[PDB]
Design an enzyme around this catalytic site. Structure first.
Site, PDB file in Angstrom:
ATOM      1  N   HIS A  92      40.635  -6.592   1.813  1.00 51.67           N
ATOM      2  CA  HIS A  92      39.939  -7.084   3.001  1.00 51.67           C
ATOM      3  C   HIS A  92      40.670  -8.292   3.556  1.00 51.67           C
ATOM      4  O   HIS A  92      41.510  -8.887   2.887  1.00 51.67           O
ATOM      5  CB  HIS A  92      38.498  -7.471   2.649  1.00 51.67           C
ATOM      6  CG  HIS A  92      37.695  -6.349   2.061  1.00 51.67           C
ATOM      7  ND1 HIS A  92      37.137  -5.349   2.830  1.00 51.67           N
ATOM      8  CD2 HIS A  92      37.353  -6.069   0.780  1.00 51.67           C
ATOM      9  CE1 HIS A  92      36.500  -4.495   2.049  1.00 51.67           C
ATOM     10  NE2 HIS A  92      36.611  -4.915   0.800  1.00 51.67           N
ATOM     11  N   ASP A  95      39.643 -11.758  10.628  1.00 49.54           N
ATOM     12  CA  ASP A  95      40.202 -12.109  11.929  1.00 49.54           C
ATOM     13  C   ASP A  95      39.095 -12.798  12.722  1.00 49.54           C
ATOM     14  O   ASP A  95      38.014 -12.230  12.919  1.00 49.54           O
ATOM     15  CB  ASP A  95      40.713 -10.847  12.635  1.00 49.54           C
ATOM     16  CG  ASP A  95      41.721 -10.064  11.789  1.00 49.54           C
ATOM     17  OD1 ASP A  95      41.382  -9.703  10.633  1.00 49.54           O
ATOM     18  OD2 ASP A  95      42.842  -9.771  12.271  1.00 49.54           O
ATOM     19  N   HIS A  97      38.098 -14.148  16.233  1.00 49.32           N
ATOM     20  CA  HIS A  97      38.437 -14.162  17.661  1.00 49.32           C
ATOM     21  C   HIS A  97      38.529 -15.586  18.242  1.00 49.32           C
ATOM     22  O   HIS A  97      39.130 -15.793  19.301  1.00 49.32           O
ATOM     23  CB  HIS A  97      37.417 -13.355  18.458  1.00 49.32           C
ATOM     24  CG  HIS A  97      37.521 -11.871  18.267  1.00 49.32           C
ATOM     25  ND1 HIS A  97      36.735 -10.980  18.969  1.00 49.32           N
ATOM     26  CD2 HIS A  97      38.331 -11.120  17.481  1.00 49.32           C
ATOM     27  CE1 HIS A  97      37.034  -9.746  18.597  1.00 49.32           C
ATOM     28  NE2 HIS A  97      38.007  -9.800  17.703  1.00 49.32           N
ATOM     29  N   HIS A 132      35.769 -10.477  12.240  1.00 46.93           N
ATOM     30  CA  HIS A 132      35.671  -9.203  11.534  1.00 46.93           C
ATOM     31  C   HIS A 132      36.879  -8.948  10.656  1.00 46.93           C
ATOM     32  O   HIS A 132      37.956  -9.470  10.901  1.00 46.93           O
ATOM     33  CB  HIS A 132      35.478  -8.012  12.516  1.00 46.93           C
ATOM     34  CG  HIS A 132      36.637  -7.788  13.446  1.00 46.93           C
ATOM     35  ND1 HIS A 132      37.741  -7.041  13.093  1.00 46.93           N
ATOM     36  CD2 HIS A 132      36.843  -8.183  14.732  1.00 46.93           C
ATOM     37  CE1 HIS A 132      38.589  -7.011  14.105  1.00 46.93           C
ATOM     38  NE2 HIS A 132      38.074  -7.708  15.107  1.00 46.93           N
ATOM     39  N   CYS A 133      36.683  -8.125   9.633  1.00 48.95           N
ATOM     40  CA  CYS A 133      37.791  -7.649   8.809  1.00 48.95           C
ATOM     41  C   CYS A 133      38.636  -6.666   9.627  1.00 48.95           C
ATOM     42  O   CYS A 133      38.110  -5.965  10.503  1.00 48.95           O
ATOM     43  CB  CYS A 133      37.218  -6.944   7.592  1.00 48.95           C
ATOM     44  SG  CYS A 133      38.434  -6.364   6.409  1.00 48.95           S
ATOM     45  N   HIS A 142      36.557  -0.570   8.493  1.00 49.92           N
ATOM     46  CA  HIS A 142      35.921  -1.780   7.939  1.00 49.92           C
ATOM     47  C   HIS A 142      34.898  -2.359   8.894  1.00 49.92           C
ATOM     48  O   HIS A 142      33.804  -2.754   8.488  1.00 49.92           O
ATOM     49  CB  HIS A 142      36.957  -2.816   7.519  1.00 49.92           C
ATOM     50  CG  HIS A 142      37.666  -2.435   6.257  1.00 49.92           C
ATOM     51  ND1 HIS A 142      37.647  -3.211   5.114  1.00 49.92           N
ATOM     52  CD2 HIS A 142      38.381  -1.326   5.952  1.00 49.92           C
ATOM     53  CE1 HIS A 142      38.326  -2.590   4.161  1.00 49.92           C
ATOM     54  NE2 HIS A 142      38.787  -1.450   4.646  1.00 49.92           N
ATOM     55  N   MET A 147      31.533  -4.886   8.433  1.00 47.60           N
ATOM     56  CA  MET A 147      32.328  -6.056   8.080  1.00 47.60           C
ATOM     57  C   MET A 147      32.686  -6.933   9.275  1.00 47.60           C
ATOM     58  O   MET A 147      33.852  -7.072   9.661  1.00 47.60           O
ATOM     59  CB  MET A 147      33.558  -5.648   7.256  1.00 47.60           C
ATOM     60  CG  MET A 147      34.033  -6.800   6.379  1.00 47.60           C
ATOM     61  SD  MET A 147      35.008  -6.321   4.935  1.00 47.60           S
ATOM     62  CE  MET A 147      35.408  -7.958   4.367  1.00 47.60           C
ATOM     63  N   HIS A 252      18.306  -7.190  26.133  1.00 45.91           N
ATOM     64  CA  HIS A 252      17.180  -7.393  27.023  1.00 45.91           C
ATOM     65  C   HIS A 252      15.986  -7.849  26.191  1.00 45.91           C
ATOM     66  O   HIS A 252      15.634  -7.222  25.194  1.00 45.91           O
ATOM     67  CB  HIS A 252      16.830  -6.072  27.718  1.00 45.91           C
ATOM     68  CG  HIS A 252      15.659  -6.183  28.638  1.00 45.91           C
ATOM     69  ND1 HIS A 252      15.799  -6.247  30.001  1.00 45.91           N
ATOM     70  CD2 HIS A 252      14.334  -6.284  28.388  1.00 45.91           C
ATOM     71  CE1 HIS A 252      14.605  -6.377  30.559  1.00 45.91           C
ATOM     72  NE2 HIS A 252      13.700  -6.412  29.601  1.00 45.91           N
ATOM     73  N   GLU A 276      17.781 -10.176  33.671  1.00 47.10           N
ATOM     74  CA  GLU A 276      16.886  -9.178  33.054  1.00 47.10           C
ATOM     75  C   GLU A 276      17.586  -8.528  31.853  1.00 47.10           C
ATOM     76  O   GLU A 276      17.027  -8.436  30.756  1.00 47.10           O
ATOM     77  CB  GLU A 276      16.433  -8.120  34.080  1.00 47.10           C
ATOM     78  CG  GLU A 276      17.525  -7.136  34.578  1.00 47.10           C
ATOM     79  CD  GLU A 276      17.008  -6.204  35.690  1.00 47.10           C
ATOM     80  OE1 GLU A 276      15.997  -5.505  35.486  1.00 47.10           O
ATOM     81  OE2 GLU A 276      17.630  -6.167  36.777  1.00 47.10           O
ATOM     82  N   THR A 277      18.823  -8.105  32.056  1.00 50.42           N
ATOM     83  CA  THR A 277      19.575  -7.386  31.035  1.00 50.42           C
ATOM     84  C   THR A 277      21.011  -7.865  31.181  1.00 50.42           C
ATOM     85  O   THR A 277      21.561  -7.854  32.286  1.00 50.42           O
ATOM     86  CB  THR A 277      19.503  -5.862  31.225  1.00 50.42           C
ATOM     87  OG1 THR A 277      18.140  -5.435  31.125  1.00 50.42           O
ATOM     88  CG2 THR A 277      20.325  -5.125  30.148  1.00 50.42           C
ATOM     89  N   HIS A 303      19.385  -2.258  25.865  1.00 49.78           N
ATOM     90  CA  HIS A 303      18.634  -1.534  26.886  1.00 49.78           C
ATOM     91  C   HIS A 303      19.233  -0.184  27.331  1.00 49.78           C
ATOM     92  O   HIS A 303      18.931   0.311  28.416  1.00 49.78           O
ATOM     93  CB  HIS A 303      18.261  -2.435  28.093  1.00 49.78           C
ATOM     94  CG  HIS A 303      16.987  -2.029  28.776  1.00 49.78           C
ATOM     95  ND1 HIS A 303      16.857  -0.827  29.444  1.00 49.78           N
ATOM     96  CD2 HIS A 303      15.792  -2.654  28.892  1.00 49.78           C
ATOM     97  CE1 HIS A 303      15.637  -0.738  29.953  1.00 49.78           C
ATOM     98  NE2 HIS A 303      14.971  -1.830  29.630  1.00 49.78           N
TER      99      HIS A 303
HETATM  100 CU    CU Z   1      13.056  -2.294  30.286  1.00 49.28          CU
HETATM  101 CU    CU Z   2      38.794  -8.085  17.013  1.00 45.59          CU
HETATM  102 CU   CU1 Z   3      37.249  -5.237   4.965  1.00 45.49          CU
END
Ligand code: CU
Ligand code: CU
Ligand code: CU1
Ligand code: CU
Ligand code: CU1
Ligand code: CU1
Lengths: 336, 337, 336
Positions: A92, A95, A97, A132-133, A142, A147, A252, A276-277, A303
């Protein structure tokens, strides 16, 4: 900063907590830049993701899906000790971001079972960010095994609206949304396996359909309901951080709104308002700020309502307080 | 406001009109807050959704898919009388994404066949907002049976661009986009059913594929074409409100643009400008403002072109006026090399 | 402008270059408005898109998938000569999303094999914009056969941030992302056809599933990887224009960010900043500006990681320069 300058900075050790809760932190930075220290142990474990007993071979940062939210401030350093216990079977890594270089840290953190590593990066950009891995050649496997998680890099002066007005939350929750791809047998029954590698080939076949069998919050259908419903009171300001490391989502709050939404997750991008969303693309985190005005049960959903109510992407809030009849009232209750 | 103050407010009864048209309204609010009254009867009805005669048991607010657009101004109260006639078979309700509390009103408007209810809410936030039915345990089935529409809460001062300049449209259309999930037989032909309930299990199976069989405007493939094409003229300013209660869409005016697009649908969020294709996530409405500059036929589409041209999500505009060769000209018409 | 004023504008012929490269241009406009002339020949040809010899009957502007990036400035005219050789078997046309009228030019440019046409349009709006073929009744089939590209209409004063500060790139790349829908036989093997029309019915069946078999940059799996990775250096400012004419994408520079991202692709809409993953809806182009801070290999992906790493939507950047331990360091290398 030079190596000497970094070595002189205060260190702070953080104890992580399981989502959707978030570890203790301050919204406005306390003092100058620090090296903020976190430790996670990776656990390959079975999780049950629905009421039919369907299993996933989870690959879980800190034993949870999603992994926990790590909170620092802009220009702090995040220093992660990552441990792959001998009990695991796969290599494993991690990373971020939020990080710059070496594929977000993945190139410097490849650990076999029985290894550990320590990565330090400078949190130069404020926002919520996926981590994430990503083992070369096995990346989505993964990630869709759970992960992934997120971090929040707060501005040193805490949050503000698009016009420089301070936005201070009372509560914060972290919703990690997960798309799962569970193999089925001839009768449409979900398959079980006795090791993660056993599931690989069948799982990849499902992944390639781009159609998740489940879309869930906090690792399972109904996870953030009942005993795990999120709570608030009328008047309370709540920040909801939401991530999805692999697939788009459209959060939402049913009965509410996103009063301020950093839909891209980045605090130097002014927030949208009165949402709203909102929309968070796969591979990102977003954050919504809302002040509760009515008591009662809220649902918080992806939603696409099939994803929410057939595939599992629905959470609840339970909110206490006084009903506001100005905002909404039943003039005539359902009647003949 | 107190109960007494709300009681003292003027009432205005509104007669709804069928999409894509919008009932008479004023862009800038006339006078102070009012209680704006609407009535809708829910109809469970068989509708045909394509030229082949494919049927859906629709669940339709006011008898249309989408339900009609309700227009109020910020800080008005919207007071809806919702009626579920005894001829229907299912319980229904309504959730206004514009509203605050009780799951958008759904918790207070659960009506069995033979029942009615009246819900009032304060339209505190300006924008276009989805509304839809959402019976607990049966939510997406009602929505993807067409039981959704939108409202517009205009700012009291009407629309403005991101920098405070007034934007006044000449006309407005409401395009509701519907994803349908119609079961097929072993030949791949669409199945027909006697009652809504009979289609339930087969339909859920299709819904779970997350792949609609049809993606349509105004309830059917080609509904906004021919004598039902939308119309405009060169120089005419058109607002196009677009909603999708369940699934993402990416509107595009072929041959035009979205000059100002409130892609999130919310008027206090400054509009994007000069858009080719905008994005409205499932569970939202958006609005685009455009001044037409060229005459002729336009197609207005969801710009997943499979969705537009294979699955049904294409409408037309007919636009009158003079061709502008400055903007575009055929220097050499198709001719032998 | 008046008729004589338009006629008096200089005409300039520009030679195109195949993606991901971009023809020479100036960021700040040189002189007043010009009529910028381009020529493209349409090629219908079989291309191989993966490591298994899977073929597509490509329909390719200028012989490439995507078609080349054409660059002009706001209020220039773009005047394209489009040629359909008599060796081709389908009618084609072109719709510029940048243009106003006649379905973007499609209504004026329908050319049968053995025909050519010249279309002029005024580039009134600044931004990156999709262009694509769109023969009435066969629109998505041409587009998903690779018949699409993008243009960039730069502001006459070049790019700026949200605060009016100039943003000047050192280099620019154009990544065109293509969803393909290749039919398979009942054993799961991709089918081959003698002529493009032979594949029509089988292809539409795949298209209607809304699930591409391949999602690729520059026309094929791995086209922008390895020895064809894009390049930069630490300190270099890079603009990455990304288009998808039919289907959503969510670009992400793994190890980097989008410092400024015109996610809608339109330069009068202020750019988002500090982006991890941005979103470009089907039928649009977007652009991201980044200054590289770390050397090494980066991956640039659609961050649906299944699309990226199972279906083909992954590119690389090879970046030279000195490592920055302030931004990131391995405090403890992977160890037992
Ligand atoms: Cu709705
Ligand atoms: Cu990524
Ligand atoms: Cu992993
Ligand atoms: Cu187009
Ligand atoms: Cu209903
Ligand atoms: Cu074509």
């Amino acid at each position: 900063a030079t190596a000497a300058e970094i070595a002189a900075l205060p260190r702070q050790k953080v104890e992580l907590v399981d989502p959707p809760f978030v570890h203790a932190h301050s919204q406005v930075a306390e003092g100058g830049p620090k090296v903020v220290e976190f430790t996670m142990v990776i656990e390959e474990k079975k999780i049950v993701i629905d009421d039919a007993g369907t299993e996933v071979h989870a690959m879980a940062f800190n034993g949870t899906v999603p992994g926990p939210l790590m909170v620092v401030h802009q220009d702090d350093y995040l220093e992660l000790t990552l441990i792959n216990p001998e009990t695991n079977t796969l290599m494993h890594n991690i990373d971020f971001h939020a990080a710059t270089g070496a594929l977000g840290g993945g190139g410097l953190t490849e650990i076999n079972p029985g290894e550990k590593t320590i990565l330090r990066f400078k949190a130069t950009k404020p926002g919520v960010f996926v981590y994430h891995c990503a083992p070369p050649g096995m990346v989505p496997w993964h990630v869709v095994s759970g992960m992934n998680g997120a971090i929040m890099v707060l501005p040193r002066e805490g949050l503000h609206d698009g016009k420089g007005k301070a936005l201070t939350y009372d509560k914060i929750y972290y919703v990690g949304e997960q798309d799962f791809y569970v193999p089925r047998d001839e009768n449409g029954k979900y398959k079980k396996y006795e090791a993660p590698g056993d599931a690989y080939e069948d799982t990849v076949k499902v992944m390639r359909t781009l159609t998740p069998t489940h879309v869930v919050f906090n690792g399972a259908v109904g996870a953030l309901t009942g005993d795990k419903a999120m709570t608030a009171a009328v008047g309370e300001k709540v920040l909801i951080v939401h991530s999805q490391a692999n697939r788009d989502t459209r959060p939402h709050l049913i009965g509410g709104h996103g009063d301020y939404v950093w839909a891209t997750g980045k605090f130097n991008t002014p927030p949208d308002v009165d949402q709203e969303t909102w929309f968070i693309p796969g591979g990102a985190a977003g954050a919504a700020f809302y002040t509760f005005q009515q008591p009662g049960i809220y649902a918080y959903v992806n939603h696409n309502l099939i994803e929410a109510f057939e595939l599992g992407a629905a959470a609840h809030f339970k909110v206490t307080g006084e009903w506001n009849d100005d905002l909404m009232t039943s003039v005539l209750a359902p009647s003949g």
